[PDB]
Amino acid sequence: MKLSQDSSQIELLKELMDLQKDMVVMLLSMLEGNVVNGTIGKQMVDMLVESSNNVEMILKFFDMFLKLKDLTSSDTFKEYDPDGKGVISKRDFHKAMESHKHYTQSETEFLLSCAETDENETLDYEEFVKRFHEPAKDIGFNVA
Numbered sequence: 001m002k003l004s005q006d007s008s009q010i011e012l013l014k015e016l017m018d019l020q021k022d023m024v025v026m027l028l029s030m031l032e033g034n035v036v037n038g039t040i041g042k043q044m045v046d047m048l049v050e051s052s053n054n055v056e057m058i059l060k061f062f063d064m065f066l067k068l069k070d071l072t073s074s075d076t077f078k079e080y081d082p083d084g085k086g087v088i089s090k091r092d093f094h095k096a097m098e099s100h101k102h103y104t105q106s107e108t109e110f111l112l113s114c115a116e117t118d119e120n121e122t123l124d125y126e127e128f129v130k131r132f133h134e135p136a137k138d139i140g141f142n143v144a
Contacts, residue, residue, distance in 0.1 A: 001061065007116035010131065017135040024142035062143070064107055065136040071100050072129045087122035090115075 003013045027044070034041050048055055071077060080096040081088045088096070094112065097103055103111065114132075115123050 001057075001110075004114045004132075014135070017139060020139050021142065024139065028142060059143070062136050062140040064103075064110070065132045066140060067102060068111075068129055069133045071097055071102075072125050074100060076100065077125075081125075086126040087120065087124045089122050090117065093123060093125065 003009045003016070030040060031044065074096075076099055077088075077096045080092045090112070093115070094108070097111065098108060115128055117123065
């Protein structure tokens with residue numbers, strides 16, 4: 001939530017997401033071959049409960065960005081967008097994702113903050129989704 005708001009460190013965000021991916025891969029390799037009530041798993045759950053705040057915050061991030069695909073594929077957003085040229089006005093975006101109303105007001109304003117404001121005033125929701133949803137899918141699958 002630091003790098004996402006700015007648009008100048010997208011490559012750094014990608015490197016960080018890849019690091020997170022390999023981290024979760026290591027954790028899965030650790031869980032490989034576990035038995036019921038295994039000591040390795042118990043140590044892992046102790047780790048998670050110690051990191052409870054960070055884990056729930058990351059999970060909230062992933063849940064927030066994983067609904068964006070349904071948001072952009074919604075027929076409501078499809079009618080707010082005159083035709084599939086790829087870019088939608090900022091006001092249309094805010095109205096659309098608030099009629100979608102699965103997003104709270106805080107989540108709303110955070111999405112606008114994370115979406116780069118262009119001088120065209122029509123933020124490219126296509127690039128936004130293809131830049132955020134896919135890393136979220138990748139890491140969230142391993143987390144799940």
